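Internal ticket #5521
Category: modeling
Description: The requester needs a full-assembly model to guide mutagenesis choices. All entity lines are attached below as received. Residue total reported by intake: 936.
Assigned to: D.W.
Attached entities:
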Amino acid sequence: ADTIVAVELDTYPNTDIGDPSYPHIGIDIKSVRSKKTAKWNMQNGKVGTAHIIYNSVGKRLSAVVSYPNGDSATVSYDVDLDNVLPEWVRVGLSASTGLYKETNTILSWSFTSKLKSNSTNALHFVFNQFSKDQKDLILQGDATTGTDGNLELTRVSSNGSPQGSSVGRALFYAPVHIWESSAVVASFDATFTFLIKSSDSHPADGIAFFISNIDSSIPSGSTGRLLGLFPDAN
Amino acid sequence: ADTIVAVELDTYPNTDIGDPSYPHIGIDIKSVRSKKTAKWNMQNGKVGTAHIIYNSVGKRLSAVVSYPNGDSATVSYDVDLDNVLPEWVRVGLSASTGLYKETNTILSWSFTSKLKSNETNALHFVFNQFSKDQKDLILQGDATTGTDGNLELTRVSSNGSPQGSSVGRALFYAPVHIWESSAVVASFDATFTFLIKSSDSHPADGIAFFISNIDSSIPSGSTGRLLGLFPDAN
Amino acid sequence: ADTIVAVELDTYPNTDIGDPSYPHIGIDIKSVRSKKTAKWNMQNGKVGTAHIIYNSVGKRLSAVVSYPNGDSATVSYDVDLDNVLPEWVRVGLSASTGLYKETNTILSWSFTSKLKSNETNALHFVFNQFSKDQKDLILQGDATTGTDGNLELTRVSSNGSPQGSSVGRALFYAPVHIWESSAVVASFDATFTFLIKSSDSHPADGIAFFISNIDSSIPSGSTGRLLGLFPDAN
Amino acid sequence: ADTIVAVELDTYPNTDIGDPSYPHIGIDIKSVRSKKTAKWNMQNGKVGTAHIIYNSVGKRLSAVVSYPNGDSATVSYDVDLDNVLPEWVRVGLSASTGLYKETNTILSWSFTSKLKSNSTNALHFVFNQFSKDQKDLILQGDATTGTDGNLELTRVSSNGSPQGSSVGRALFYAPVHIWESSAVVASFDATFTFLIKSSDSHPADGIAFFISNIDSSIPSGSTGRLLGLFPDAN
Ligand SMILES: CO[C@@H]1O[C@H](CO)[C@@H](O[C@H]2O[C@H](CO)[C@@H](O)[C@H](O)[C@@H]2O)[C@H](O)[C@@H]1O
Ligand SMILES: CO[C@@H]1O[C@H](CO)[C@@H](O[C@H]2O[C@H](CO)[C@@H](O)[C@H](O)[C@@H]2O)[C@H](O)[C@@H]1O
Ligand SMILES: CO[C@@H]1O[C@H](CO)[C@@H](O[C@H]2O[C@H](CO)[C@@H](O)[C@H](O)[C@@H]2O)[C@H](O)[C@@H]1O
Ligand SMILES: CO[C@@H]1O[C@H](CO)[C@@H](O[C@H]2O[C@H](CO)[C@@H](O)[C@H](O)[C@@H]2O)[C@H](O)[C@@H]1O
Ligand SMILES: [Ca+2]
Ligand SMILES: [Ca+2]
Ligand SMILES: [Ca+2]
Ligand SMILES: [Ca+2]
Ligand SMILES: [Mn+2]
Ligand SMILES: [Mn+2]
Ligand SMILES: [Mn+2]
Ligand SMILES: [Mn+2]
């Protein structure tokens, strides 16, 4: 299967599969069943910001999600990504809807990865605007870009209305050398701003930043609770 | 054919096709026949640094090549890249040998592109070492990656000996959005360090940083004076 | 006197001292009488962006001023700043009013300087929010920081009204090493966003990004057309 | 007393004040007695690199010291620096010798701090070469810069021999806004490369990256095991 590291903003509690019984942020290591979660109040129709930091030296993947009012949720998990991820990866953003839905709108996305010995390899990109033809993104499933300048990870019905059983992802075009055996520091950070909007009984399913094998594809049947990330709930 | 913008470090005077009659640096705009050149003393077997700066506001593409002893060559050309390049490009390094040869070894290469506004998209990468399997580079022709942690643009022997009739290029994997009609600033810079070494009667043929259409390939017969860049000498 | 290189956003035509007869951006080198100007449509009450670029290869001091409707004015002047500026400087923002007035509100300011090779010294600061007690800015004359996250270079009344005969500057706290003899490029850039509002159909006097000796202070009487920069209009 | 957060590269075990009985990197929070240490193989006369990372999400102050053969030592300590540091600080490098001595030579220092909320205030500096009159560094005690491009924190004799009972520090000229209550992520990193050379039975006393109140000065008698940081060994 693919190998997945993800920070999910999980708007829908699937308690059947380990979710806590609230919207949450969580850190996913090779499983949709988060290794750590924090209660998250998603603010409907508001623009949130997710910051994801992996500290290669502290061996700690950390995330915060916040909204302009001050409200933030924070999660940290101690992990050495050297033992999890392959050396080369693609990075991206994933969202899904299932029986319930929400807009999974990305308004900006940056990423910085650095491999240090004494000499550094580094990759930084920032999207503050997405083109209708955003050639440096691989769009997968239902994901689209433009002309409002946003990345729509799942189907949105152009009057702005979220569609259910949708799954979409965007990966940065270039593979990322995310760790190296000889790298003293293999750190990365990612930032994205998003607009989740739902009028549903409950919003579902969430957005994730993720790191995958290079050839990673949306697994068959990963709408809903699987966030476009996983083939199953294991 | 391809659309090419390049800064050449041309180790070989092809005075039959417009070269000045000395090793030179030059700024190539859709032709191997540089728009501006400066005399350049290539220092055999020394590590040189090339800095390329495109100032989108100043509409000036500038280049310096220097060596540790301070000796530098500078060229600037006034040009609006909006009128030359397609919106989406690949950026890369090119080198060739012909009837004469030299090593065209790249030891480092960084690039930063930024589009403002009204906000900023950016791409920055830096390579200080090149891996055997450098997945974020499209290698073309004879170009191979390290060790000695180096990018060899043209054929060299494992024991350091350059080959004639060689052409190779390395392009960053991701397409770059190099300008956009609504960009207030569409600037970029590139830097690379290189080791050109020859025991030939004359070193040839040079190294270029270039920017091409996304699908750019080595044009047939662009070994030698063309310097993996152009289909002919027009 | 101080030594001043400035990029002026001059709102008030002082035709008796060589201003053209329209609001303009200009490049000032040791004189308030710009070496080069471009006509500028100041958009009253709109948030403008100024971007300022110089490197020691092209030696072209460029500035663009743009508003989010996409109107922009650009000005460039080739000038060798090695020959103009002290090696070490402070960098700053300055603004002034005289008989006529405007708010000279800075909403953000960023600056980068670099000296490469053989390696890099760099200074980069970004202020997107100014703090009430901004310990890394030297505020001079009427300049004040909020709350409201803004820098008001010149005095604004309680009722929102800009006051005349005001001058103020903010300089970054650290000296900046603007050129170094062994450097093979020296580059700087600066960007700032600003909000000039006038209810006089006579906004005055304007805002400058400036570079000066480290001990630079507001020349006496440099309110109004002298922009907080010059002791006289020579 | 100053408030000190520091990462120490402690060459000399002062077991009577809680050092482990080996050279060590440690995390110091308001005491010379490190909250956490790791055993460190100081490679006499090799250029080492220290990397220090903290962010306010993960709140893990991590540091690694490595040498080009790939030997590294890492230490991390979870600590909420909001509760330790003043909001504004100066950042610096400190070193000392006592009865025993070592060159405490700094070959490079880079620092970045950022305060993000909605998408950022930032300070970044890098010194790869120290200038004889480095106007953006505040040198304290025995510390001296240039003409060799290095910063010698402690006294080195004309014949190359390091002197005992020496303390010197370099702080960056500007105050750094290390935390802000409205920031959702405050982060800093620091990298420095160093060359510790002893010809004796033993090297002492070590080098620290430190963060302090803006008016921080060398405490009296803080040569030796106090590393220029602390007034006592409490
Ligand atoms: C076992 O019963 C299930 O009930 C839920 C909804 O109540 C439904 O889950 C689907 O929709 C949610 C919300 O989008 C997703 O999280 C799930 O993955 C799934 O698609 C089941 O289908 C059943 O009715
Ligand atoms: C007609 O004579 C030409 O002679 C030159 C060199 O003697 C040769 O040029 C080749 O080699 C150079 C140097 O490497 C390249 O720049 C050229 O493109 C070419 O490959 C010509 O082929 C002719 O013989
Ligand atoms: C000529 O006498 C004055 O009238 C002028 C206006 O022409 C005024 O100049 C002041 O105001 C302008 C606009 O703000 C500035 O550019 C000048 O420097 C100055 O402050 C004089 O002060 C007198 O009123
Ligand atoms: C016990 O008397 C002293 O001997 C110690 C060392 O054992 C010496 O300490 C000095 O040197 C060490 C090593 O440099 C430092 O860590 C100390 O702080 C101090 O400078 C004393 O000075 C006496 O010689
Ligand atoms: Ca869920
Ligand atoms: Ca040639
Ligand atoms: Ca004027
Ligand atoms: Ca000690
Ligand atoms: Mn979950
Ligand atoms: Mn040529
Ligand atoms: Mn003017
Ligand atoms: Mn210790």
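Resolution: model delivered.
Comment from assignee: Residues A 10, 12-14, 19, 205-206, 225 surround calcium ion (ligand 5) (CB under 6 Å).
Ticket closed.
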